[PDB]
Design a protein around this ligand. Sequence first.
Ligand code: CA
Ligand code: CA
Lengths: 527, 196
Amino acid sequence: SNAMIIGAKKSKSGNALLFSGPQVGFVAPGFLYEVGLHSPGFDMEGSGFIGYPFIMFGANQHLALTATAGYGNVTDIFEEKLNPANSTQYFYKGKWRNMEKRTETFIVRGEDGKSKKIEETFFHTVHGPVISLDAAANVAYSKSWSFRGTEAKSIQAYMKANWAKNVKEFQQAASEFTMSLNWYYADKKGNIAYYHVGKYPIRSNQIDDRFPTPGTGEYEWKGFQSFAKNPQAINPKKGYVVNWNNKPSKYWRNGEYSIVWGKDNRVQQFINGIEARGKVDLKDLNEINYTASFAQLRTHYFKPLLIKTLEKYQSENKEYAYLVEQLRKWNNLKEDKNHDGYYDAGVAAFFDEWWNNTHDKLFNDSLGIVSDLTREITDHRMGATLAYKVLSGEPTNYQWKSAAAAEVIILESTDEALAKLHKEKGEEADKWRAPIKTMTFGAKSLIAIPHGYGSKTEIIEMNRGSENHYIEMTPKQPEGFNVTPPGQIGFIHKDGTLSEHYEDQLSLYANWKFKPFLFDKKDVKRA
Amino acid sequence: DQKKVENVTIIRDSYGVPHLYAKNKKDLYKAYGYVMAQDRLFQLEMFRRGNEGTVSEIFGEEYVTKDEQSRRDGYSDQEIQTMLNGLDRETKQLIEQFAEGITAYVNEAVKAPDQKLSKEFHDYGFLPRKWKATDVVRLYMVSMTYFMDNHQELKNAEILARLERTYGKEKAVKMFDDLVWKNDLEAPTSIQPDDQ
Ligand SMILES: [Ca+2]
Ligand SMILES: [Ca+2]
């Protein structure tokens, strides 16, 4: 998920701006629900996740808000020391403790139509539910959520945010939210504010918080840190805040999940867009969102590395010369502006294969035996920090490859990628243009169960929020535009007829058009 | 359009988005649940089933292990009621109204199922059940917990253990620090330390 808030000084009109882009996948019915709420002293338009009694992306009369996944450290796994003579007992504070037992029944619809009945036993310790067993080592793994039992207090906190009228009330609501999210704030007075919300535990400083914590009782949480210690800022001096699930602040850690917060981070797409402009408007935010959605994210750090290597040898290798010309003219996007079904920049097909070849050569001979666990780290969708440090010759703890060995890899990957394109397409980069990846608003969301029948319509894959709001807090009222695909109404008639509002926003989404943000009842009636 | 479900006016714009106009929050949040049910009743039903670990009753064995995971890590109704009882009385009451709103459309749709129950209900041969405030909290947990929950600590332990047994502890420790760092000081940040 990505977000941007622009303070008054960074905005052309002098009004604070807000941009939302929650990434919760693409399903039909959609993962978001858009609504307008209006009661005495409470007027708010926007969308929230399906089922939530509050808006998460939009604005009330006073403030605009959005959120992104925080990726903070709110989940710890505890390594329970089991009794060798009783697997349902673990050692805690000097004495054996009995696990809590619970038998659950599951009814399963058989393909034949009838239903079967399955029984399972789940176990609990003082730290939480047992998620895994290492019986061979007399170990059980339990899971502690910092937000255990406080999910309803988080709902209440989000509802108080809806009702809030100023930074003070919004921050109070932020301070009560117990789960790990980034909150973004913009108001009609020109203020913007950012909060890494959640209840983050005070951990033992005698453990490595990238690994499970021994459950014997000496390394227990000692409460939660004060909200003042949560990353946050009101009116940061840079004049704005951008985020794509990246690190909140230089020294804020998230233990086991650091892999999302490296030098190579996809937020660079939003940093580049904002830093390449002076004062900005909603039009600008939209062009930066377009860039992020279609960018080949490895290009930021790895296309310069590639070019630097090839330029050393392009005098004698005409193919390297042609590649460097094509790479340099490429705008780093995998886009389909003419809607011919093929990405416009043919050299993007080469870069894709070059990267894949390069990642394989960097780590296969060392991590291949563990690539079932590490490939998702070293080829992460948010960035390839370790790969970049190796190829760029920057310091690493283990000497993976020298800068000279790295260059040899970059070259070998180029030769192999180019040789495959010559054999299958030809020598002109125009012929390398790859067919666009498409997707559909399907039936199954991140909760991993079916909630409908989905949608047929194929649109180009976009690394983009599942909705977008562009809001400008003008002195009069919030203003702007948004899109909430596939459509408002997920109703299918018994006879198969889709509601007229089942997917009437998919064309807007795929063609980078939007509908007006409505706040004034006068405008709502004529919409 | 501009309907009037109870003392709340509902204006649906050209995209079908409902705009609710109420005289107090109690009415507003009931209408909130009602319009969401009008538009997404089957989706609400299945999302609630996701949290309760009862999807297998509808879509079969393919979702048994997901149901088991949901119940393993989930809460009982009484546990969720205890959470609601810890909220401000107004907040609890509005969540109840939200559920009463959903229940209002449930009751309305079972009385005219051929026109108000979506096709999935007819094809899979079951009916939606009424709603309680606890179920509303369930709709929040099923989706929001996903973004907080992970077992990367266990993956990390397995990574270091398999590196250690092949390469030795000294080398594995260095490899793992490059894989899962303690703090990459050059990672882009949303705010600077001076902004705290
Ligand atoms: Ca942790
Ligand atoms: Ca094209």
